[PDB]
Scaffold this active site. Structure first.
Site, mmCIF file in Angstrom:
data_model
loop_
_atom_site.group_PDB
_atom_site.id
_atom_site.type_symbol
_atom_site.label_atom_id
_atom_site.label_comp_id
_atom_site.label_asym_id
_atom_site.label_seq_id
_atom_site.Cartn_x
_atom_site.Cartn_y
_atom_site.Cartn_z
ATOM 1 N N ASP A 155 7.962 1.342 0.242
ATOM 2 C CA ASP A 155 8.507 1.609 -1.090
ATOM 3 C C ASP A 155 7.453 2.187 -2.016
ATOM 4 O O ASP A 155 7.424 1.886 -3.218
ATOM 5 C CB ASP A 155 9.152 0.349 -1.692
ATOM 6 C CG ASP A 155 10.241 0.659 -2.728
ATOM 7 O OD1 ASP A 155 10.578 -0.258 -3.501
ATOM 8 O OD2 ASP A 155 10.769 1.794 -2.771
ATOM 9 N N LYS A 157 5.991 4.435 -4.614
ATOM 10 C CA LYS A 157 6.474 5.274 -5.712
ATOM 11 C C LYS A 157 5.768 4.800 -6.989
ATOM 12 O O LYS A 157 5.243 3.685 -7.024
ATOM 13 C CB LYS A 157 8.004 5.203 -5.859
ATOM 14 C CG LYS A 157 8.542 3.808 -6.096
ATOM 15 C CD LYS A 157 10.041 3.791 -6.194
ATOM 16 C CE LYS A 157 10.531 2.368 -6.404
ATOM 17 N NZ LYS A 157 11.998 2.362 -6.563
ATOM 18 N N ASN A 160 6.160 1.235 -8.722
ATOM 19 C CA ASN A 160 5.680 0.040 -8.051
ATOM 20 C C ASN A 160 4.162 -0.129 -8.131
ATOM 21 O O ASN A 160 3.631 -1.072 -7.535
ATOM 22 C CB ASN A 160 6.133 0.020 -6.581
ATOM 23 C CG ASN A 160 7.597 -0.305 -6.433
ATOM 24 O OD1 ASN A 160 8.227 -0.798 -7.370
ATOM 25 N ND2 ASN A 160 8.138 -0.082 -5.239
ATOM 26 N N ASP A 173 6.013 -5.220 -5.769
ATOM 27 C CA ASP A 173 7.331 -5.047 -5.190
ATOM 28 C C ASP A 173 7.187 -4.848 -3.688
ATOM 29 O O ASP A 173 6.907 -3.742 -3.208
ATOM 30 C CB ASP A 173 8.120 -3.924 -5.867
ATOM 31 C CG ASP A 173 9.598 -3.937 -5.514
ATOM 32 O OD1 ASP A 173 10.385 -3.227 -6.224
ATOM 33 O OD2 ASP A 173 9.986 -4.676 -4.580
ATOM 34 N N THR A 190 13.322 5.009 -1.780
ATOM 35 C CA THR A 190 13.877 5.885 -2.804
ATOM 36 C C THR A 190 13.930 7.313 -2.273
ATOM 37 O O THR A 190 12.986 7.751 -1.611
ATOM 38 C CB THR A 190 13.032 5.817 -4.082
ATOM 39 O OG1 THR A 190 13.179 4.523 -4.661
ATOM 40 C CG2 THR A 190 13.495 6.821 -5.120
#
Length: 339
Positions: A155, A157, A160, A173, A190
């Site tokens: 994840d 991005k 985070n 996260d 995402t």
């Protein structure tokens, strides 16, 4: 290299001991005062809280057990907590307590008042290459650590990545992080950051994190991501195409590194070759990076967020303040026994 080898061997030993015997039930809700909602999602929220006896501030992630079940996140939430309580690295947020009640799961983490990289990047527009490189180096070391423990992050991005009081990254996260040797199959992450093999429903491995690093570096240095469109399906078409356009202000070294991270053939992608992470660490774009000094937090940061103190929420946005409801009856007890 023996120094790095022995460091990672000890890291795995310490992770495995905590992985095999996870902590549980180390605080309760009424030990905290509620201050502010810091973010919200489909199955939970993050709240600034203050511990009533110590006065310490924390970020408390609250997950509604019933929504976790409906949105098919049970295994992911158990992964998130089991991994977070077991890791220890300078650029990973520390989990301080966890507990559950009739309705919710709770993870109480260090609070980082500097805010998310997402906000700073959109405010400034784009980061210079030195600035992007400082952040990228921390992610490279963090993935070297996580991957050595057979963990995939899944994840990466800007939302985070929190920026701390020294200007260094704290990855938050772990909702999609997973321990896996070899391949895994879940569609998650995402759209803008997904590697082609995720989009095409393959059994994929840690190479997807190195792809996402390429997307992150591009977005940090350009101000926008390399594959952008109004609909996810249009984004996915660009991702699988093998075509990326670079702004003319990018250095040649940056373009060369990005072609090797944003490599559609996972068997040729940097970070997934015989030389592993060293193909990245030894690339010309990182020639000015002192990897040990970054790990030791001895490099002066490009940017120190402005904040007034450990309780300041100015770098976070405003959300409707909703109740945290705890049912009189236990929900989903069986599903979350191990939490």
């Amino acid at each position: 290299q023996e120094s790095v080898k022995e460091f990672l061997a000890k890291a795995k030993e310490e992770f495995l001991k905590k992985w095999e015997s996870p902590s549980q039930n180390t605080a309760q809700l009424d030990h905290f005062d509620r201050i502010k909602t810091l973010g919200t999602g489909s199955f939970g929220r993050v709240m600034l809280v203050k511990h009533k006896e110590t006065g310490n501030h924390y970020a408390m992630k609250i997950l509604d057990k019933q929504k976790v079940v409906k949105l098919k996140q049970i295994e992911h939430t158990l992964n998130e907590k089991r991994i977070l309580q077991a890791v220890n690295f300078p650029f990973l947020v520390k989990l301080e307590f966890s507990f559950k009640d009739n309705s919710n799961l709770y993870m109480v983490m260090e609070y980082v008042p500097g805010g998310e990289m997402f906000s700073h990047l959109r405010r400034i527009g784009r980061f210079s290459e030195p600035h992007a490189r400082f952040y990228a180096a921390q992610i490279v070391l963090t993935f070297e650590y996580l991957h050595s423990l057979d963990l995939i992050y899944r994840d990466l991005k800007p939302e985070n990545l929190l920026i701390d009081q020294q200007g260094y990254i704290q990855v938050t996260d772990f909702g999609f992080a997973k321990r896996v040797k070899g391949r895994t199959w879940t569609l998650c992450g995402t759209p803008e950051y997904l590697a082609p093999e995720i989009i095409l429903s393959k059994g994929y491995n840690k190479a997807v994190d190195w792809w996402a690093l390429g997307v992150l570096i591009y977005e940090m240095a350009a101000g926008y991501p390399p594959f952008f469109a109004d609909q996810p399906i249009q984004i996915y078409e660009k991702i699988v195409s093998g075509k990326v356009r670079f702004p003319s202000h990018f250095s040649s070294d940056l373009k060369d590194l990005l072609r090797n991270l944003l490599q559609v053939d996972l068997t040729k992608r940097f970070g997934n070759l015989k030389n592993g992470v060293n193909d990245i660490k030894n690339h010309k774009w990182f020639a000015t990076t002192d990897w040990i000094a970054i790990y030791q937090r001895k490099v002066e940061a490009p940017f120190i967020p402005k904040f007034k103190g450990p309780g300041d929420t100015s770098n976070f946005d405003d959300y409707e303040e909703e109740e945290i409801r705890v049912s009189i009856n236990e929900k989903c007890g069986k599903e979350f026994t191990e939490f």
